[PDB]
Design an enzyme around this catalytic site. Structure first.
Site, PDB file in Angstrom:
ATOM      1  N   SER A  16      41.364  46.788  47.451  1.00 17.19           N
ATOM      2  CA  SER A  16      41.620  45.755  48.451  1.00 17.19           C
ATOM      3  C   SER A  16      41.874  46.277  49.861  1.00 17.19           C
ATOM      4  O   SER A  16      41.357  45.678  50.821  1.00 17.19           O
ATOM      5  CB  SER A  16      42.774  44.841  48.033  1.00 17.19           C
ATOM      6  OG  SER A  16      42.315  43.848  47.152  1.00 17.19           O
ATOM      7  N   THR A  61      47.755  40.828  42.413  1.00 21.35           N
ATOM      8  CA  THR A  61      46.955  41.102  41.231  1.00 21.35           C
ATOM      9  C   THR A  61      47.841  41.108  39.987  1.00 21.35           C
ATOM     10  O   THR A  61      49.019  40.727  40.041  1.00 21.35           O
ATOM     11  CB  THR A  61      46.135  42.424  41.392  1.00 21.35           C
ATOM     12  OG1 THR A  61      45.153  42.526  40.349  1.00 21.35           O
ATOM     13  CG2 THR A  61      47.053  43.638  41.351  1.00 21.35           C
ATOM     14  N   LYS A  65      50.254  36.977  39.066  1.00 23.39           N
ATOM     15  CA  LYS A  65      49.619  35.738  39.551  1.00 23.39           C
ATOM     16  C   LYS A  65      50.335  34.437  39.186  1.00 23.39           C
ATOM     17  O   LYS A  65      50.288  33.478  39.950  1.00 23.39           O
ATOM     18  CB  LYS A  65      48.135  35.685  39.175  1.00 23.39           C
ATOM     19  CG  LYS A  65      47.363  36.862  39.784  1.00 23.39           C
ATOM     20  CD  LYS A  65      45.889  36.807  39.382  1.00 23.39           C
ATOM     21  CE  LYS A  65      45.130  37.929  40.070  1.00 23.39           C
ATOM     22  NZ  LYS A  65      43.670  37.897  39.727  1.00 23.39           N
ATOM     23  N   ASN A  86      46.434  34.257  43.474  1.00 26.72           N
ATOM     24  CA  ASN A  86      46.235  35.659  43.797  1.00 26.72           C
ATOM     25  C   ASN A  86      46.465  35.918  45.282  1.00 26.72           C
ATOM     26  O   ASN A  86      46.143  36.995  45.798  1.00 26.72           O
ATOM     27  CB  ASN A  86      44.814  36.083  43.424  1.00 26.72           C
ATOM     28  CG  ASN A  86      43.789  35.521  44.378  1.00 26.72           C
ATOM     29  OD1 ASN A  86      43.963  34.421  44.906  1.00 26.72           O
ATOM     30  ND2 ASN A  86      42.713  36.268  44.606  1.00 26.72           N
ATOM     31  N   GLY A 122      44.982  35.593  30.645  1.00 29.46           N
ATOM     32  CA  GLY A 122      45.856  36.041  31.718  1.00 29.46           C
ATOM     33  C   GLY A 122      45.640  35.265  33.004  1.00 29.46           C
ATOM     34  O   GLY A 122      45.007  34.210  33.003  1.00 29.46           O
ATOM     35  N   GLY A 232      33.502  44.476  38.647  1.00 29.06           N
ATOM     36  CA  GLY A 232      34.655  43.851  39.273  1.00 29.06           C
ATOM     37  C   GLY A 232      34.675  44.003  40.781  1.00 29.06           C
ATOM     38  O   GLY A 232      35.383  43.271  41.482  1.00 29.06           O
TER      39      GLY A 232
HETATM   40  O1  LIG Z   1      43.129  44.687  44.724  1.00 32.52           O
HETATM   41  C1  LIG Z   1      42.760  44.200  43.646  1.00 32.52           C
HETATM   42  O2  LIG Z   1      42.415  44.955  42.718  1.00 32.52           O
HETATM   43  C2  LIG Z   1      42.728  42.691  43.482  1.00 32.52           C
HETATM   44  C3  LIG Z   1      43.252  41.818  44.662  1.00 32.52           C
HETATM   45  C4  LIG Z   1      43.513  40.388  44.102  1.00 32.52           C
HETATM   46  O3  LIG Z   1      43.618  39.571  45.216  1.00 32.52           O
HETATM   47  C5  LIG Z   1      42.348  39.953  43.257  1.00 32.52           C
HETATM   48  O4  LIG Z   1      42.560  38.598  42.868  1.00 32.52           O
HETATM   49  C6  LIG Z   1      42.159  40.771  42.011  1.00 32.52           C
HETATM   50  O5  LIG Z   1      43.158  40.472  41.054  1.00 32.52           O
HETATM   51  C7  LIG Z   1      42.253  42.169  42.353  1.00 32.52           C
HETATM   52 BR   LIG Z   2      48.362  37.970  36.249  1.00 28.26          BR
END
Ligand SMILES: O=C(O)C1=C[C@@H](O)[C@H](O)[C@H](O)C1
Ligand SMILES: [Br-]
Ligand SMILES: [Br-]
Ligand SMILES: [Br-]
Ligand SMILES: [Br-]
Ligand SMILES: [Br-]
Ligand SMILES: [Br-]
Length: 265
Positions: A16, A61, A65, A86, A122, A232
């Site tokens: 992220s 994450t 959540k 999220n 989840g 992913g």
């Molecule tokens: O940095 C990450 O790996 C993520 C950021 C979340 O906002 C996303 O929703 C996801 O769960 C993963």
């Molecule tokens: Br979660």
């Protein structure tokens, strides 16, 4: 000069920051920061409640959540629908919960119109249900270890107009569930999916929420079998667009963020 970041546990693997920092630079927000914060579900309210006034938002994450949704005093319609969040966005007097994983699923897949399978129960699983519904799937089978949580996912699916049912992993219905399905969205750990990969391998399209380590055993199986594999990272990109919009108040610089994704290892 503002702050954001991503909360979860484990968190060290998160890509992220790479995407958000690329976006902030593209938007001319050059002194903004984005960090990883190790944070479990129980700890989330104390961590977020401790943030100073320069925090504009955090991504959330696993495993936080559900905690994120509860913590927020306002929620978007889509967060209220999904039942997990999220994204937390700072408001003048508190925090708003949103769910951009719906965009993650819909954007990564592009299109879907038939029978679908969702693995897990989840915090990402209900986003997969709603994202698939948005794409227009006719029916969803939820496969999870937790049958009580799966029942909640069935209700959700039904409420968004999709025929939904539960299938246990181990009782003998998985093969028939796979045979009917055209798309599989996996939200379970790679170590759990591995033991079912031979059965799941026949799915025409796989979206795996996991991106590190990569490839997952499930992804290797589907890929070998001739199926389309979507990692992913593609879900990460597509969910990140709406997060940048809410943190910055500006349109997501999609070109810059897509280039950042390509610059990852
Ligand atoms: O940095 C990450 O790996 C993520 C950021 C979340 O906002 C996303 O929703 C996801 O769960 C993963
Ligand atoms: Br979660
Ligand atoms: Br601060
Ligand atoms: Br606001
Ligand atoms: Br089976
Ligand atoms: Br586990
Ligand atoms: Br990718």
């Amino acid at each position: 000069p503002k702050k954001a970041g991503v909360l979860g546990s484990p968190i060290a693997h998160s890509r992220s920051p790479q995407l958000h920092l690329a976006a902030y630079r593209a938007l001319g927000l050059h002194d903004w920061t984005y960090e990883r914060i190790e944070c479990g579900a129980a700890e989330l309210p104390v961590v977020v409640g401790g943030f100073g006034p320069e925090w504009v938002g955090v991504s959330v994450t696993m495993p936080g959540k559900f905690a994120a949704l509860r913590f927020a005093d306002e929620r978007t319609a889509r967060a209220d629908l999904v039942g997990s969040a999220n994204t937390l966005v700072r408001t003048p007097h508190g925090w708003r919960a949103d769910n951009t994983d719906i965009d993650g699923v819909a954007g990564a897949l592009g299109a879907a119109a038939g029978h679908a399978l969702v693995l897990g129960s989840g915090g990402t699983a209900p986003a997969a249900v709603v994202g698939l519904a948005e794409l227009g799937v006719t029916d969803i089978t939820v496969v999870a270890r937790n049958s009580d949580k799966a029942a909640r996912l069935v209700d959700l699916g039904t409420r968004v107009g999709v025929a939904t049912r539960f299938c246990a992993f181990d009782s003998g219905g998985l093969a028939d569930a796979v045979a009917a399905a055209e798309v599989l969205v996996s939200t379970i750990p790679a170590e759990v999916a591995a033991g079912y990969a031979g059965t799941l391998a026949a799915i025409p399209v796989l979206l795996d929420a996991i991106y590190d380590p990569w490839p997952t055993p499930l992804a290797a199986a589907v890929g070998s079998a001739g199926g389309r594999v979507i990692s992913g990272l593609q879900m990460l990109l597509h969910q990140a667009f709406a997060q940048v919009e809410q943190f910055t108040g500006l349109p997501a610089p999609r070109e810059a963020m897509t280039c950042a994704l390509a610059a990852l290892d």
